[PDB]
Amino acid sequence: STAGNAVLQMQAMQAKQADIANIPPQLTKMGGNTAFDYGNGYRGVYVIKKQLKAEYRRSLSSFFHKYGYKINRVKKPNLRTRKAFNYVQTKDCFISGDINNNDLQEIRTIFDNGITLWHTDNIGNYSVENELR
Amino acid sequence: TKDCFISGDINNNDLQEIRTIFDNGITLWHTDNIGNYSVENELR
Amino acid sequence: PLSGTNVRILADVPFSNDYKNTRWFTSSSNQYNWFNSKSRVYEMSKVTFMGFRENKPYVSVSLPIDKLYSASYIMFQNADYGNKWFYAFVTELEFKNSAVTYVHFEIDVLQTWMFDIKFQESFIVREHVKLWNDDGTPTINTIDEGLS
Amino acid sequence: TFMGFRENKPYVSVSLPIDKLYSASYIMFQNADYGNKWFYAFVTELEFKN
C-alpha cells in the first residue's frame, strides 16, 4: 500500500490511450483554387496556438500538484524547494551518515517507497499554491 | 456476477458468502439429471 | 472502549464488515435516530466489556443463543466521551452456557467517527457527478472509460 | 525502564488504564548516555496488562 505503487496505479488509470494528431484530414483539399483562397482572405502564414481541453488541464494539473513531475534522472532529491510540501520517491537510493546500518537501510526504503515532506503545520491541506522558496 | 448485491433476512456473514458464490459463478439445475449437458436446455 | 452505558444490541442492520455499503447521515442526531428506529433485541443501562486480552472484544448478554439470532448491531455510550454514540458490528456468537450468551463486537470506524473525519484533496477513481446543466444540456465528461 | 524485551516488540509500562490511551499517537524521550538527543517513536499498538 506504499505511496509509490499508489501513484503508479493512478498513472495506469489515466494512462495515455492516444496522442492528439492535429493533422486535419482535409489538408489535401485546401489549395488548388486560387480564386477561392484569396476571395475568402486566405493568404500568407497563420500561427495557430493550441492547448489541451480545460477538463484535462484540471485533471493533470491536480495530479502534478500533489505528486510532482516524472523525473527519471540520478541526482540529490528536492526535499525543501516548495513552501508547503515536497513529494519524493526514489529507486535504490543512497543515504549515508552516522547511523546504524539497520536504521539507515530503513530510511533508504522510506524514500524508495515515496513520501510527502511537509513544511507547514497544516498537513494534508493540498489546496495551497505550494510555490517555490 | 461481479460485486453482486443480495439482500434478505440472513446474518450478514452468510449473506456475504452467498454473494461470493454467485460472484464466482455457478450452474443452477432444474432437472434431477445433474451434469447431463446433452439436453436442449430451451426456455420456459 | 473499556466501559459502556445505555447499551443496545441491534437487529436489521444490513451493512457488514465488507464496508462495501453503509448508510450515510446528515447529522449526529439523524445518525442516532436512524439507529434508534430498530427492533431492540436487547438493552442494558451499564455494561463492563471484558473481552480485553487477545483482542476479540465482547459483552456478556443474558439471553440464550436462541432468540439472539436476530442480533446484528451494537450501539453504546461511554462516560468519557459524553453522549457520543459508539457503533459496532456483531462479529460472532460464542458458547457460554445455555441461558446467557456472549455477544462479541467490532467498532464501526465509519459510523462511529463519521462526523469526526475531514476528507482532504485525494485522487478519486470513480464517483457520481453532476449529470445535467441548468439548460438541460449534458455536462461534459470525456474521460476514456475504455469500454466497448 | 523500557521493557520491550523481545527483539521485535518493545513497550513501556504506563500506569493508567487502556481506555484513556486511545489518543496516544507518539512518544519522545531522551537518554542519559546519548546526551541531549531526542528520540521519536510511533505508538504502534496498545496492549492490556491489567
Count of domains forming chain C: 1
CA–CA min distance D23, chain C (Å): 12
Closest to D1 (Cα-Cα) out of D22, D29, D43, D39: D29
Residues 57-96 of C with CB under 8 A from B: 69, 72
A34: left (phi over 0), alpha (psi -120 to 50) or beta: alpha
Q: Which domain holds residue C145?
A: 1-148
Q: How many interface pairs between A and C have CB atoms less than 8 angstroms apart?
A: 20
Closest to C8 (Cα-Cα) out of C90, C81, C101, C117: C90
CA–CA gap between residue B18 and residue B22 (Å, rounded): 7
Q: Given in angstroms, what resolution was this structure solved at?
A: 3.5
**What is the Rg, in whole angstroms, of the alpha carbon atoms belonging to chain D?**
12
Chains C and D touch (3+ CB pairs under 8 A): yes
Does D20 contact C80 at a Cβ distance shorter than 8 Å?
A: yes
Closest to A71 (Cα-Cα) out of A89, A93, A92: A89
Task: Return the SS3 of C89.
Answer: strand
CA–CA gap between residue C103 and residue B44 (Å, rounded): 47
Backbone angles phi, psi at A30, to 5 degrees: -75, -40
Q: Which three cell numbers stand for residue B11?
A: 446474518
Q: H or E segment at D32?
A: none
Sign (positive/negative) of CA torsion C57, C62, C67, C71? negative
CA–CA gap between residue C106 and residue C74 (Å, rounded): 9
Backbone angles phi, psi at A36, to 5 degrees: -70, -45
Max CA separation in chain A (angstroms): 82
Q: Return the residue in D21, D48, D49, D50 with the most chain C beta carbons within 10 A, the one to mutate for interface testing.
A: D48
Q: H or E segment at B22?
A: helix B12-23
Give CA torsion, residues C77, C80, C83, C84, to 10 deg: -70
Residue carrying C-alpha cell 484540471: A58
Closest to A3 (Cα-Cα) out of A76, A125, A130, A90: A90
| Range list of H helices, C1-148 | 28-36, 109-113
CA–CA gap between residue A109 and residue A66 (Å, rounded): 21
CA–CA min distance C101, chain B (Å): 17
Q: Return the residue in A55, A60, A61 with the most chain C beta carbons within 10 A, the one to mutate for interface testing.
A: A55
Chains B and C touch (3+ CB pairs under 8 A): yes
Of chain D, the end-to-end C-alpha distance in Å amounts to 19
The CA-atom distances, in angstroms, between A30 and each of A25, A44, A48, A125 are: 10, 14, 16, 52
The CA-atom distances, in angstroms, between A5 and each of A10, A26, C34, C68 are: 8, 43, 39, 45
Q: Which three cell numbers stand for residue A116?
A: 510527502
The CA-atom distances, in angstroms, between C142 and each of A20, C42, C130, C134, C139 are: 14, 52, 14, 19, 10
CB C57 within 8 A of CB C105: yes
Closest to C72 (Cα-Cα) out of C8, C3, C116, C137: C8
Measured between CB atoms, which of C18, C69, C72 is closest to B16? C18
CA–CA gap between residue D11 and residue D21 (Å, rounded): 14
Task: Return the SS3 of C46.
Answer: strand
Measured between CB atoms, which of C53, C78, C80 is closest to D48? C53
CA–CA min distance D48, chain C (Å): 6
CB C142 within 8 A of CB A13: no
Q: Which three cell numbers stand for residue A14?
A: 489515466
CA–CA gap between residue A55 and residue A14 (Å, rounded): 13
Closest to D11 (Cα-Cα) out of D20, D21, D1, D19: D1
Name D6's bridge partners. Answer: D9
Length of chain C: 148
Of chain A, the end-to-end C-alpha distance in Å amounts to 31
Does A127 contact C144 at a Cβ distance shorter than 8 Å?
A: no
CB C86 within 8 A of CB B26: no
Chain C neighbors of A14, CB-CB under 8 A: 143
Q: H or E segment at B23?
A: helix B12-23
Q: In the 3-class helix/strand/coil scheme, how is chain A assigned residue by residue?
A: CCHHHHHHHHHHHCCCCCCCCCCCCCHHHCCCCHHHHHHCCCCCCCCCCCCCCHHHHHHHHHHHHHHCCCCCCCCCCCCCCECCEEEECCCCCCCCCCCCHHHHHHHHHHHHCCEEEECCCCCCCCCCCCCEC
